[PDB]
Every structure is written in structure tokens, then in C-alpha cells.
A paper describes a structure:
Meanwhile, the AAV1 and AAV5 particles alone were treated under identical conditions to obtain the unbound structures to identify potential conformational shifts upon receptor binding. The cryo-EM micrographs indicate the presence of AAVR on the AAV1 and AAV5 capsids, but at distinct positions. The final resolutions of the cryo-EM reconstruction were estimated by the FSC 0.143 cutoff to be 3.07 Å for AAV1 alone, 3.30 Å for the AAV1-AAVR complex, 3.18 Å for AAV5 alone, and 3.18 Å for the AAV5-AAVR complex. The binding of PKD2 to the AAV1 capsid resulted in a conformational change at the βGH9-ɑGH10 loop, which is the counterpart of the βGH2-βGH3 loop of AAV2 and has conformational movement upon AAVR binding. The counterpart of the AAV2 βBC1-βC loop in AAV1, which underwent a significant shift in the AAVR-bound AAV2 state, shows no obvious structural shift compared with the location of this loop in the unbound AAV1 structure. Notably, in the third region, two arginine residues in AAV2, AAV2R585 and AAV2R588, directly bind with HSPG or its analogs, but the corresponding residues in AAV1 and AAV5 are serine, threonine, or asparagine residues, which do not have long side chains with positive charges. This may explain why HSPG binding plays a dominant role in AAV2 entry, but not in AAV1/4/5/6 entry.
Residue numbers in the entry:
A (entry chain A): 219 to 736
B (entry chain A): 427 to 633
C (entry chain A): 427 to 529
D (entry chain A), E (entry chain A): 219 to 426
The structure:
């Protein structure tokens, strides 16, 4: 309880209990003043955009805390100690804390700008635990907690979008004043805590399958079911049309009667990582798989959880079917291939189709003595009965949860970016600096205020998620595939800082390393 | 089922819902384009507003049990419905639980859409038709599509004063909302259970 | 809904996920095939990685309420979406719950 | 209880109960120094007015809080959710609170005016619950709480009028020194609260 | 419990009991900011060394307290009163305390650099009582407590070495982020105390 008394300690440990891991993570934050305390409405009129990129929205002076990436809670060691000996994980409960608040006023005087310390200024913090603001989280934005605990981050600006007839509002476009929510004004001796319990979500499949879906049979025993084998005799005298059935088939496994189907599909396009093995065009909007929502288009990206490439064909990635992260020294537009981290999603090849190739062929017509049997090509495939799949892999860099939209219907509510679909996700914690105005005039004027004291706050923030682990019960004999670090003479250790203190992550780490039978 | 899915209505009572009936007048003077709606319809049951949909589909190919009513080819691998898993193909066989044939068209069976058992004196490779027991799956015709024919047609383009309205042909159909079906029949010879694979997701886990 | 499905993002914050942006260089010398990735994208929302998909579909046909903006035919049975149950056809009507028209 | 401890939170919610609505509304205010702490007497002699616009009065260094407009308590949504499914409304009780006080001293030096922070300066607040000052409220003046909760407003100046034989006083013109009222001196760690209960007033006919 | 309240006294006495001596020793310390808050990795590539002097390591922004010399606890008189009439000694238990913390912010302006006083800034202190960091102590380094109690010392910088294939890392070279340890953030009114008990070590042979 301040001033000269700290209102919280630095908790950043990670206790691995038996069938659970509790990860704690404290960060130092910094919050500026956004919009100069205004609710500026944003749209696409001033930008001069296309029909697809039009928007209508509102930007707020409020910040928001987001801890929706896996490295905000797991170190690279605790991630390795998670992915290599667990068949699953899910979060049980989190525990948020906001402490040691310091509101600093800055004053410019000929570029000799001094920063002083407001002991009496407050900071308004609320958590929207009733989900009645637009949930801008679960959208893979920047401004999370940093991966490395010794970094100071800057809180993003909260700003939402609503309904838009192009670049204009419709009468059902909502507007949200966030000072119409009960806040908690936090002067420098006060702290903000709240707790959250996750609802029952399934465990993330942190395993690959040790067995394909079309190879679930005994390779030594044939069946009692038959299939049509020949529609023509090998007598070679003429067109000897004859229906020849065959018991089937240890020696042919593509033609046995199966029992299940591979998952849904929506094809992407071959983009090789070698520039010469590509079409000389652009081809990134004209030839991309996209959905049409209210007359305007949008690339699916990633979409249906599918295998990235075929066996021993590692150079092709689906155009928008992979999560692509960024290394440092990457720009924000038209970066090179050497600065990105394209993830591979080929461990789910056992159940899921290749993203860049059809889910098989179907019949088109009626075969007869005249009409030869034509087949078609299924490119997109929805859900059939008897159909199994695996969802998209999570990563250390990638998102943890997302909000299931409040709709009348939804099919398999797992986010297409990977993660945990939550109807009641962790609520948004919003934070702003209370406006402290400058000197008012001597007489009265009702044109409210443009003159404020230029200030900002800083502090610490600690998030503590408890995760429920799922132990392997494997009866595999031979050793399994692990995430190891290459023991070699290296210039720079992976997942450590540089010669001048830049923390880098050299590659994306998935979680599908252990195996189990299908 | 003692009742079809597209015949769940009262055949004596019409409805309060209308459908578009004519896009052209019977005045026969010219191209008299006019939108004529009609209350609908005890006398036409194909055009009433329905409430549900028949089940999923993945088409097979007509193979008649009479050798002369077939194409003179083989045609059992090149023209079979198959799925692609890790770059290599596999016939679906049987796949989606569908009706084997249309009404009074008992001679056609889907190429790999039926369970085919074996009588004795059957070989293990290239046996004749007289030694196998091809099952029929036509009791589920009320809810399920014919395995050897499309699940209907959809629109392709935008109709106008110039572009005449083209339709396509849906061959494979996944799961839509509002869609009912019946699973594949069990037999005295056939399997009792199977293991649901240990995967993160699976749709309608019936073998 | 007060919010679209393809517009569930923060319009102020970009992402950490990238997408393939260009398969060809703007150097204009030749067919300069090069894979250009881009961090994405507050300024382009059609190409961001999304997380969900819009619902199922089964297309119908444009019939305008103005008679002159229609094809001069009938066209109400030959060009209607229909399902085939036991060899006989039936118009779907209404079918899959879908939006009637564009903005 | 200050200095480094906030003396109230931001309450601005609006709970709609069954046969009642409770509207809460927090605003940030700013109060200057008026008249340079003086009781300047005001009249219409210096103005050169008409006979109708003559007045005689007194302006004070005191401010006053006014929340006498309906948008100070109702949002446009809560107003719509009031007018469309209610045949009437009336206020039952209010509950006033004044908190997180920051007294700032400003010092001019060649237009490089710095604003510092007096931790020891006080602020005098009283509520005239016996109605023995001229009631300048209920006159549709400016300087209420703003409609929008994220606006900082400026407190008006209290100044009253009394009896006037034209632009001159009559012997029955009252004069009110407001430091002859018991105030509550509020240093930066203190707060002002009081509660009020409305008497029985009829429901407003919110119907045609 | 600060601000205007000291969180510990100056204890620097040395009580000689019967079969034991308790030595207390208070020092004033000063801790700068190292690496500008960065985890800079250090190696021998930039130095141009011999094969014997190659190293690979990591320097941290963390300081460390070391009191691993005998004059940090014994005066020259108490040492003489130890060595001359004792056949041995060994430590039984220590008792650490860290108090009266003052965080000072310095601001440069044309070489007229003023030092101000952050009342709200914190200081993170932890003791690695599970021995899971590289133990750089026990290596005879500088930056201990001074011998003389009236000296102000400067806390050294913590920086460790790991495995090195010459001037390069091997895959088994460990990296330690020290903000992945639970610290105790100490604002100016708080203090750090912990206690330690030595395990059974033999007496030092303080005899010929």
C-alpha cells in the first residue's frame, strides 16, 4: 500500500506438479494516452481502399492487456518439457494481477522534457466479465506480453469494428462508450486482481498418430467382404464385359472396404519455396481460396486443418494454409522468405488431407454401353458422416484461445488458427489513464476540454494460468521423436539473447511429437 | 422407414408458404418475363417448402449385374470413387451409407458401395458373380440418396436478361445443417463393432 | 449480429501470423518469380488468417422482383435447386438458412 | 486515504431492476479560482442595459455542482429503454460522492508555466441542505455534468441576484457570505459524500 | 516502513560468547543499471584470444551480493582475538538483511545532471537457495563488502560462463533468464531478509 510500499512482488516461476503445470509470468508494462482521451470514429473513407477492405469502427483511449500467446506463459524449456511427455493439455484457471502502479507526467520544454511523478493520478481498470464489448482478442494481434520476461512492452489501443454498408454505418452499428462500465480507479498504492476459471474444453491433441487412417487393417488377414474387381475379362477376344468380384485384399489395401473417412477439405494452391518453381504472376489474390461474406471476399487463411504437403515433397506450402510467424528484422509489408517462419502441419497427414490437393474424385454420370464412365474432382468437401480429422497444431508463438461467436449454430468450434474455442473466454481487461486536465480559465466555458496534462503510467502485470496435463499411456517399444536442441559448435544459442540483448526465437515449435495408435 | 423424407406432408392440406412458380407469362405474346408466385401445393409435392434434407453423398458408379449392360473396360480402378491420403489413393468402399439403386432398377449396384460377402467355392481373386453375395441397401432410400446418382443440382451463375440460368451437378456432398440420414445396415455375416480412432475430431463415429 | 464473421479482429493491431503476399516481384524486369510474405494486415482484412468459417451453402437462382430483370423462360423447375430422393426430384425450398441478397 | 491511495472508484453503471432503474454517473471535474477569492458585487450600471435587463447581485469565489439534466444520468440507450416501455418515472433518492481530489498549483515563468501538486492544500465543500441560499439551480444553466462520460468539465461560478430598484439595491436586498456556512475542508486524501431522498412528486406522464 | 520511516538499523557489533563468536557487519551499497537491462551474450570472438583463454557466456543486468572474504566479518582486532587463542573455527549460521532502500533517478542536462528520488520504483531481490544458477561466487572476485565499515561499495555484475567449443556454443550450453526466478520487488519502504544454516564442515586447523 503505497507510496513508499510495494503492492506486489515479481512472480515468474513455473511449478510442474503431477498432472498439472502452473505457469506464472510477470511483465513490466507501459501505457500511453491514446487519441488524446477521445473516442475517434474510424472508417475507410479517408484511406481509399477496395470494396473488400472497407470498415467502419471506433477507436478508444483505452488500452487492453492480452496474454493470448503460448510463450507468454511457457519458457522454451517448459514448452519442451510439455510437448515431449504429454499427450495433451488444457487450461483450468487463470489468476490475473496488476500491481506497482506508477503514473508519470511528462512536460516538454525546448526538448529538455522532464518526466515527473504524479502521486495522486489514477488509472481506471475493468475486466469485461460479461462479454458485452466487441472481443478484439482472439485475432492474433501484436502487443501481448513479450516472450522474454526482461522486456518492457507497450499496451495496445482498444478499437472495435461494427457493421458497415461499405465505408458507412448502418442503423444497427453499435457504439460503445467504455466509461459506461464500472471501472476501478487505481492510484499508485492500489492494485487490480481478478480470477477466472476456464470452462470444460477438450484437451489439445499434442500427439501425432502412429498409424494412417487408410491403413487400420491387419496386413496378414483378408476379409469376408468383397469388392468389384474387373468389369472386363482378360480373355482378350473382344469387349468381354463381365463383373468379376474378388475377396479383398491383403495385397491391395487401396481397394478394401474401409470404415471411416478422412476429414473435410478446402483446397489451397502450390507455392514452392523455390521462386523458380512458381508461376510468374501475382496469383496471391486471383488464385487464392476465399470466402464471400456480404458481397466482399476474404482469404480463408488458414481454414480447414489439413496437411501442408505430401510425403518427401517438403518444399511446397499451401498459399494460405499455414501459420507464418516472423523472425526479427522482418518488415510489415513484402518481407523476404528468409525473415519468416513458415510452419509445417504434416504430422496430421494420417487423418487429414493434403491442403494442396483434392479429397478424391466422385462419379459424374451414368456408365453404359455408350457413355464411358466419367469422374469429377472434389475440391471443397464439407462434413460427411463417418468422418474423422485432427485440428490445427498449436505453437509456442501462436494463440491460446479464441471466442466462439454467439451464433445460433456452429460446427466443431475450434479456431482455424489453432487453440481452444471458448464460449466464455478470458475476459478483456481494459485500462486507461484518468484524464487530469490543465488549468481551466477564470470564467466559465462549456466547450469541455482540449487541454490535459500529458502523462502516462507504468507498472507490473502477472498472469498465472494452471494447465491440466494428460500423461501418455504409451506401450510403444522403440524411442519416440523428441524436440532436441542441436548440440554443435554454435555462434548463438537458440532461444537466448544476442550480443546486444535482442531475444530471438529461431524456429516455430509445434506440440505433436509423441505418437499413439489411431 | 414407412415414409419418405420428401413426403412428410399432409396430402390433403395446402400451406401458407408460397414459392416462385413462373418466371414467364402464358400470354405467349413475347418474352413476357413476370414473377408468378403460387400457394403451394398438394398437387405438386416436389416444389413445396420442406424442412429437412437428405443425407450426405459421395457418388459411386453403375455396375450392372448383366455383363452386357456395362462399359467394355476396367474401369474398376480408373473409374472408382477414391480418397487421397498421403499421396496414395484408396477406394472408399463402402463409404457413405446410401441407397444402392433407384426404384425398380434392382440390377445396378454401386461399384464399391455395397458389402459383398462370399459363398463357399469362392476363390480369393477374380471370382464370378455366382459365388458372391452382394447386399442391397435400398431400405434406407427414404432418407438417404442413391449411391449411384447425385444429391441434386445447385446454381452456378447469375441469371439476367443475357445470361441464361446455368446449373451444376453436385456429386459429393458433405454435411449441411438440417440434414438427416440412416447408417449402413448390419448383416449376420458382417462386423459387429469397430474402434473409433483416437483423433482430435471425428464426425458421426459410425463405421 | 452486430458484427460480421470476417470482421472479428482489432482494426488497430496487426498480427504475428504471416501470409504469402506476392508470387512475383515488382522489379518488372521479367517473370521474376519470388515468394514475398507479409505481416498481416490491418489495412487488408480479406487476407488475414481467420479462425472460423461461414455456414453451409446450396445455391438458389436470382429472381428479381422486376419482371424485366429476369430471363424470358420458365426457369422455375428447370433452373431450380432440387434434391433427388428415390428417382424423383423435389425443390429444396427453403433449405439451408442463408442470406437472401447482398448489400 | 491518500496520498498514494485512491479515495473512490469509477462507478458509471446503470442497473435496471424490476420497477426501478438506478443510474450511476462519474465525471472528472476541474475547479478554478474565481474572482481571485473575492465577493465582487455585480449590477447593471456598468453594462448600460434596458429597464428590463437591470439586475443587482453578488458573485462569489465558490463553485457549484449541478446535475440537473437528464443525460447526466441516462445514456441514449437507457433513455430509449426508459421512454418506450414505461408510462412514467420519478426519482426516489440520490447519492452524491466527491472523491480523488487533486489540488494543483500553477506558476508562471516566461510562458513556461509549470503545474505542481499541493499535497497540503484543502478544498471546502458543503451542501446547503437547509435551502437558505438563493437557489440558482433549476434555471437551465450550462456547466452540468457532460452528456458523455469521458469528458472533463469545468465547475461554474456561484453568483446570485437579489432585490433591485433598477440597478441599485433596496434595503431588503440580502447578502450571503458563504464562509458563514460550515464547510468540509478536503485535503487530497479525503472525500465528500452525502445522500438525499426526494419527496413524493407525481410520476411524469411519459405517454401520449 | 517507508517513506519517512527507516526499515532497519546499523548493526555492526561483534559479540564474543563462550564457545562461539557472532560477527555482524553493515555496509552501504550502490547498484547501477547493467547492460541497459539486457542479456548480452559474451564470448571470446571479439577479443582475439589464445586457445586457453576462449570462453562463451552470458552477462546479465543483475547484481549480486558477495561477502566471501574474512575481513567482511572480522575486524583486525577480532581476527587477532580469533587466531591467537583458538585451535579452530567454522561457521554455523548466517543471517542476511537488506534494508533502507533508496532508488534514485538521474537526469542529464548539459552536464548539470541532477539526481532525483523515485519513491515508487522497485528493486527485485532473490536468493537462489536451490543452487540452480551457475555459482560465480567462490572464485575470489572483487566487489565484496569492503574491509572497513565506513566505505560504500558498488555491487558487481552477474555474468556466467557455459560450455564452449572454442569461442562457440555447444548444444548443451545452458542459458539462464533470471526473471524466470521468483523475485521480491522492494519499493523504498520494504526490506529483504533471509537466514541460512551451514552444514557440518570440519573446523579449520588454525594451528601449526
Amino acid at each position: 500500500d503505497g507510496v513508499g510500499n510495494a503492492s506486489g512482488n515479481w512472480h515468474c516461476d513455473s511449478t510442474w506438479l503431477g498432472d498439472r503445470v502452473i505457469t506464472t509470468s510477470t511483465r513490466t508494462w507501459a501505457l500511453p494516452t491514446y487519441n488524446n482521451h477521445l473516442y475517434k470514429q474510424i472508417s475507410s473513407a479517408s484511406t481509399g481502399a477496395s470494396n473488400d477492405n472497407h470498415y467502419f469502427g471506433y477507436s478508444t483511449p483505452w488500452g487492453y492487456f492480452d496474454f493470448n500467446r503460448f510463450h507468454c506463459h511457457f519458457s522454451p524449456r517448459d514448452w519442451q518439457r510439455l510437448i515431449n511427455n504429454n499427450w495433451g493439455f488444457r487450461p483450468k484457471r487463470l489468476n490475473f494481477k496488476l500491481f506497482n502502479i506508477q503514473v508519470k507526467e511528462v512536460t516538454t520544454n525546448d526538448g529538455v522534457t522532464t518526466i515527473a511523478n504524479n502521486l495522486t493520478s489514477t488509472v481506471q481498470v475493468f475486466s469485461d466479465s460479461e462479454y458485452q464489448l466487441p472481443y478484439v482478442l482472439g485475432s492474433a494481434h501484436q502487443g501481448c506480453l513479450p516472450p522474454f520476461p526482461a522486456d518492457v512492452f507497450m499496451i495496445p489501443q482498444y478499437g472495435y469494428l461494427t457493421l458497415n454498408n461499405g465505408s458507412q454505418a448502418v442503423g444497427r452499428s453499435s457504439f460503445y462508450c467504455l466509461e459506461y462500465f464500472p471501472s476501478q480507479m487505481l492510484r499508485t498504492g492500489n492494485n487490480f486482481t481478478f480470477s477466472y476459471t476456464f470452462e470444460e474444453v477438450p484437451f489439445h491433441s499434442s500427439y501425432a498418430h502412429s498409424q494412417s487412417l487408410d491403413r487400420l487393417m491387419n496386413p496378414l488377414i483378408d476379409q469376408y467382404l468383397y469388392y468389384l474387381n474387373r468389369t472386363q475379362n482378360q480373355s482378350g477376344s473382344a469387349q468381354n464385359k463381365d463383373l468379376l468380384f474378388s475377396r479383398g485384399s491383403p495385397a491391395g489395401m487401396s481397394v478394401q472396404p474401409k470404415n471411416w473417412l478422412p476429414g473435410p477439405c478446402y483446397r489451397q494452391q502450390r507455392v514452392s519455396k523455390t521462386k523458380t518453381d512458381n508461376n510468374n504472376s501475382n496469383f496471391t489474390w486471383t488464385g487464392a481460396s476465399k470466402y464471400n461474406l456480404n458481397g466482399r471476399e476474404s482469404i480463408i487463411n488458414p481454414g480447414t486443418a489439413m496437411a501442408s504437403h505430401k510425403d518427401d515433397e517438403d518444399k511446397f506450402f499451401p498459399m494460405s494454409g499455414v501459420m507464418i510467424f516472423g523472425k526479427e528484422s522482418a518488415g510489415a509489408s513484402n518481407t523476404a522468405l528468409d525473415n519468416v517462419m513458415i510452419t509445417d502441419e504434416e504430422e496430421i497427414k494420417a487423418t487429414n488431407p493434403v491442403a494442396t490437393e483434392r479429397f478424391g474424385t466422385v462419379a459424374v454420370n451414368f456408365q453404359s454401353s455408350s457413355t464411358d464412365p466419367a469422374t469429377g474432382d472434389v475440391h471443397a468437401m464439407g462434413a460427411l458422416p463417418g468422418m474423422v480429422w485432427q485440428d490445427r497444431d498449436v505453437y509456442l508463438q501462436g494463440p491460446i484461445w479464441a471466442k466462439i461467436p454467439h451464433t445460433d449454430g456452429h460446427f466443431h468450434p475450434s479456431p482455424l488458427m489453432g487453440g481452444f474455442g471458448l464460449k466464455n473466454p478470458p475476459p478483456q481487461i481494459l485500462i486507461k489513464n484518468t484524464p487530469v486536465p490543465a488549468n481551466p480559465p477564470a470564467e466559465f466555458s462549456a466547450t469541455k476540454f482540449a487541454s490535459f496534462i500529458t502523462q502516462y503510467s507504468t507498472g507490473q502485470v502477472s498472469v498465472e494460468i494452471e494447465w491440466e496435463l494428460q500423461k501418455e499411456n504409451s506401450k510403444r517399444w522403440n524411442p519416440e521423436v523428441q524436440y532436441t536442441s542441436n548440440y554443435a559448435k554454435s555462434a548463438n544459442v537458440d532461444f537466448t539473447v544476442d550480443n546486444n540483448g535482442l531475444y530471438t526465437e529461431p524456429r516455430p515449435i509445434g506440440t505433436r511429437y509423441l505418437t499413439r495408435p489411431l
